[PDB]
Amino acid sequence: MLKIILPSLMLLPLTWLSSPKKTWTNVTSYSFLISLTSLTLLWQTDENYKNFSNMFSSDPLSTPLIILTAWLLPLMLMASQNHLKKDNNVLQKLYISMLISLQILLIMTFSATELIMFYILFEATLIPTLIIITRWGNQTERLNAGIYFLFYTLIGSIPLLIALILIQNHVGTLNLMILSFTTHTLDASWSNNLLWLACMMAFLIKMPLYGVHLWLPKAHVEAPIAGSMILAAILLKLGSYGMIRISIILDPLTKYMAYPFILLSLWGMIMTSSICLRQTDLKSLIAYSSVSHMALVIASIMIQTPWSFMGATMLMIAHGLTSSLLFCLANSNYERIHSRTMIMARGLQMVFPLMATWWLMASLANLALPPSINLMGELFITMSLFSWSNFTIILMGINIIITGMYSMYMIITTQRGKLTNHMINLQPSHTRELTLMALHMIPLILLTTSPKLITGLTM
Amino acid sequence: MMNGRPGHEPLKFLPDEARSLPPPKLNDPRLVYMGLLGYCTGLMDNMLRMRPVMRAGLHRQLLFVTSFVFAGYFYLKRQNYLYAVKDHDMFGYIKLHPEDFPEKEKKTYAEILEPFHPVR
Amino acid sequence: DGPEKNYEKTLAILQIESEKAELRLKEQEVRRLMRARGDGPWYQFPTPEKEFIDHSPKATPDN
Amino acid sequence: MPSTFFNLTMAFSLSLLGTLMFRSHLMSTLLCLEGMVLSLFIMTSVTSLNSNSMSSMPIPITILVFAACEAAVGLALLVKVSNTYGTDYVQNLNLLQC
Amino acid sequence: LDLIWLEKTIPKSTSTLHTNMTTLTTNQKGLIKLYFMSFLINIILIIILYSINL
Amino acid sequence: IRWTYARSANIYPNFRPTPKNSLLGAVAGFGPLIFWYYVFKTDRDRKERLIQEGKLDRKFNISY
Amino acid sequence: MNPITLAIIYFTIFLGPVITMSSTNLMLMWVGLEFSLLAIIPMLINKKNPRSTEAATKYFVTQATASMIILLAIVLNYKQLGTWMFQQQTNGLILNMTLMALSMKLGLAPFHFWLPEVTQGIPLHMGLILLTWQKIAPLSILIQIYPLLNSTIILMLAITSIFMGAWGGLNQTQMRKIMAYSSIAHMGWMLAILPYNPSLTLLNLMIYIILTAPMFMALMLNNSMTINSISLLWNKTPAMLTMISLMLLSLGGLPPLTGFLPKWIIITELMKNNCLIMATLMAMMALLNLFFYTRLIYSTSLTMFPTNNNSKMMTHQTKTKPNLMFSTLAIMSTMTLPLAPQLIT
Amino acid sequence: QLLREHWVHILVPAGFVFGCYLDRKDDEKLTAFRNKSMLFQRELRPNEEVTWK
Amino acid sequence: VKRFFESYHEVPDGTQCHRKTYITTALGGICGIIGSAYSVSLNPADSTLEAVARVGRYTFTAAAIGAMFGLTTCVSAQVREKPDDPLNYFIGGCAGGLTLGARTHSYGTAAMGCVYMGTAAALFKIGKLEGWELFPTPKV
């Protein structure tokens, strides 16, 4: 794991020592090489998990998240290159440093084998996202968005810290593999119910429920493109990863203690898809779509079926890729027009043909299309939920119908129709942003071609 | 909590029993990180005084790194002594009071009946 | 290298973590017993010193 | 001796109540402080004389020295307060609340 | 829901509670007579707590 | 711009709690949750009772 | 001033806590406390403004009353046992009076009301000297009587100090009052962990001191008094901003800054002693502390408040920042979390 | 120092080499149960020092 | 009064509702007296009559909160026959919060008091059920 962490650590001296005319080139190229290096722990021949160190470990669950983070860092650099062109060199290098530190801390978080170290790196990732959102956001409400994001996360995470220290004082180790082996059943008391709530609510805040979710649209609207990318593609999945990790020591009482959150997830995915239907902001629409998909992930992890876990992992990776792609496309239009109003730019398929192709493919990934890991994850989540109770299929069907409706509504209202001819400042395309869309979409095709990698722990 | 132990000479940084312990290898992550902190201290001092960040004050940066490594080495040796003597006192107390720390026999997974909770 | 290297490394890591957990529980029990009845090296609260008691004969015999 | 020590403890309690309950006069507060000091001196002297602790007999002299030092500092601060305002009123010195 | 009532329930109500409580806490005048009266009340409460718990 | 601002950032500054909207928010935020709670709870209790009494058989359900 | 009386006053300021922490007689601890108070008063009233006079008066009467209660406790102990130290079998009333009076010396709630008042209206270096150096001698006396303390009164004082400090720092806009309420909250944490581990309150005291020394140094550099005054720091000293933000986050207790370590280890020890309710409440109010720190960070670092015309002349001139003191303490107070087993003792 | 100028291109490769070295050092650090597992526990071969390095 | 607050728990819930209501009302009255003393010390009234009025108002408000809490908790334990259950204490704490809101004349204060005080009372019932040691003597 150190062979991946240390080059990413040395990215920062490269960033601060590179010439100002070569900084973006050097950091982007070496971060691509670091992702290529991070591809090496897919070499999983045996069923044994790759335990490199006494503190670092690999997993069929942790590996796709690490590879996605290492892949997404150069994509964030490419996306954030254009909107920092009229900026001080020190500020540009500081922004690149924030992105690189996010990548380092997230790789360490996913590869950490101890829950307390996972918590430390969890809040360590909480810091530079706040700095990015507040310092480089565009509108006034970035400060409110940062406050909401930070303190939703912290009020979630403090009972998680209390619960982790309780578990460490009880069993003596707080190591994931020792807990997984000598896990102990809980005697179903009110203290154990509160312990379950304390160790769940941090991750239930971090990936959005129907309740606490109000920080996500604010942060996504007010964040720059790299911040939206890192949030919607890694941090919600970080909450899901934490839930999958910590659910193993709560064996007997999850089967009744998970009831309110399953209902909250299903009805909330319906309501957030409805908001996507009647939403006037493109980034808000993508954010609420992310809430709906993560609600599906919450329901699968709560019902704790092998099909549910596999579908949860597939939906995690697929949703990260397609949400980053949608955010990048919306950011390209926003860099053209300097407004996120959805109804204002309408006939963009006329002037941007292949960007419209990327829009069409991104929306076909957003809805569940059967040659895609999106439909793979959503379909196996549906199968596990219907096994859990047959009446969940009604909520699933309503969610799928509204999902198709808001995705095709997005395509029709922002690409098709008569072109708003008054918008003179529609530059043709940047090879950079077309490359950005291609680097989002081609991994979706490859993971569709071989979905055994995205299958998680259970099979 | 360990200040009242027998043989505790007061305000002694490193007693002779610490001489029984292996010292840090002088290139271990604690001391390398201490040197890195000293280097970052020098760089931050240059940036705050509005000098070139690394081109200026090489003697200051050298003194910072050297002092951080020196103090970190001696403090690390003291902490190794403290942890070692804590483990020694704990093991001695265990050996002194065996009736309060029974060697509990665990049985195999063939007599214990763990309840099974199906996840239908 | 092969599956045996990762297998044995995992076994060594598990042994280290299990011994550390056992020692942490032992440390908790030892500290609790010592503070409950201070008889080991730890939690030795002080006491007025013997070496400042005057044992010389006094002006009054009844001392 | 226990009755007298109870009376001295109650005298200290009364002087403490006087110190805590202000009546418009920093000088009266300092007077209550020195009443507390006098009560402590009498308590220490009576205890040392009863226990024949001639080795601990310098303790009342030490507390008297440090008490007069603090009374000196309080009188100097009262002089500065009077130079600032001219009335020496604890309710008049109140402008640090904001 | 998402623009009125979840907002009114969790974050805005928490912020309103804490700003009301910080106004109530920092509503002090700079009168050391009042401060020492409060200190006397603290001493009385500590004495009563000792006499009750014992 | 005015339409977008009125639809987005003006609603909570111009929201006033009334008993009507309090009742509406309570029913719209809790009634579906309680309804689907009782639906799933009754269905799962019936399924668990059938499995425990043996009247429900999994014919070829191997992977759930 | 005058160098001779500067030497006398500063030596007595040093000598007070040294006598208190190195003396085994309660009387000599009390005369050390008296030394500290009487020596620090002329350093407080030095600018000879009405605010300085008021702050000196308030500080004097508060510390004099608290020291008189301390001396009452010492004399009552001497009456009961004949010794000059609370050995093991003293009266709980005597011990509770000692704790209450030392709490009023320290300045934690509900005895906290004078501390933002005194810290306001006093120059920044004297506020630093107060909020760091004056809190070691009463803490030394409290550590000396490590058992035989009332855990109930300790936990009540700790929880109310953390609550009131969080609320006060949330309300205040004056930087010195913000620092005073931060002091109240951190003293609440130290007092909370006091009866279970003296090492952890010593560690939290050291972390707090090395965290708020460079905060006061950075305030002292530009003589910044208010939130607006610290907000126009991007024009005055733009290199300060990252260290200011990191130290404010470390005071908030965010991982992976080393200010997370004292709260983390105190919560760990309280879990070991089964005080989950107190630990949870303390952690939530620490989140409130982090909120007012983060508002400060928004003002000074992550946004750029408007500046005025004369800051051009300020940029024309040259400055001076203390070597070996600011940068060293800032680095050791931000990036020393992986040395946590070495820091705990 | 014959090439000079853009010297910074060895920083990330140096970090990668050092990371591989640290992984090798951790493998040498663990070293327990070299052939002591119940699963493999094979003979040491006529010409072989250790099973894995 | 330590034996008084222990005599609160000498009988199980749903028994001696009058005794439990009286004990909780006394506890609330003590808390209101302490709070009123702090209020009239820190923020003085314009005259002694207003000070006495504020003390009486605060004491009666806290006594009403305690009385309604104890009464509703014991009534719930009576009407559904399971005393060791935290939902009775949650209902009672919500009733106490509603009493607070009625005294303060604010439905928002009523709702927030209901939620917070019900959570606190349920946590207290769980603590008394499963032996949570508030203010523990140092052991480790």
Ligand SMILES: CCCCCCCCCCCCCCCCCC(=O)OC[C@H](COP(=O)([O-])OCC[N+](C)(C)C)OC(=O)CCCCCCCCCCCCCCCCC
């Ligand atoms: C962001 C989400 C916030 C809301 C949900 C948070 C979780 C809700 C349920 C858990 C209770 C509250 C958190 C407790 C954390 C520790 C849990 C734990 O260790 O439990 C086992 C412990 C019990 O320890 P135990 O299990 O060792 O008990 C001994 C048991 N025997 C004897 C059988 C071995 O639970 C507690 O101690 C709970 C005490 C809580 C006291 C503080 C409550 C504060 C207020 C509650 C809400 C706080 C968050 C919201 C703040 C406001 C936000 C707007």
Ligand SMILES: CCCCCCCCCCCCCCCCCC(=O)OC[C@H](COP(=O)(O)OCCN)OC(=O)CCCCCCCCCCCCCCCCC
């Ligand atoms: C793992 C975590 C990932 C997280 C995100 C990572 C992003 C960065 C990625 C960097 C590169 C990693 C690539 C990972 C995928 C590799 C795909 C691959 O080569 O898979 C192997 C597969 C043959 O392997 P095999 O064992 O036969 O497959 C399983 C059979 N039991 O090979 C093949 O089958 C050949 C594949 C290449 C040949 C071209 C395929 C063209 C497919 C056209 C599809 C058209 C329809 C698309 C419809 C889309 C609708 C939305």
Ligand SMILES: CCCCCCCCCCCCCCCCCC(=O)OC[C@H](COP(=O)(O)OCCN)OC(=O)CCCCCCCCCCCCCCCCC
């Ligand atoms: C359905 C699910 C239910 C379960 C989950 C419940 C919990 C969900 C998570 C918590 C809720 C979100 C909290 C964070 C967001 C709210 C805070 C906020 O944004 O406050 C803003 C406001 C200041 O506004 P400002 O921007 O300064 O003003 C305009 C320009 N000056 O700020 C203020 O006015 C003051 C803000 C104070 C700081 C708030 C955050 C800290 C909260 C501490 C909690 C303490 C708990 C214990 C309390 C005592 C015991 C009851």
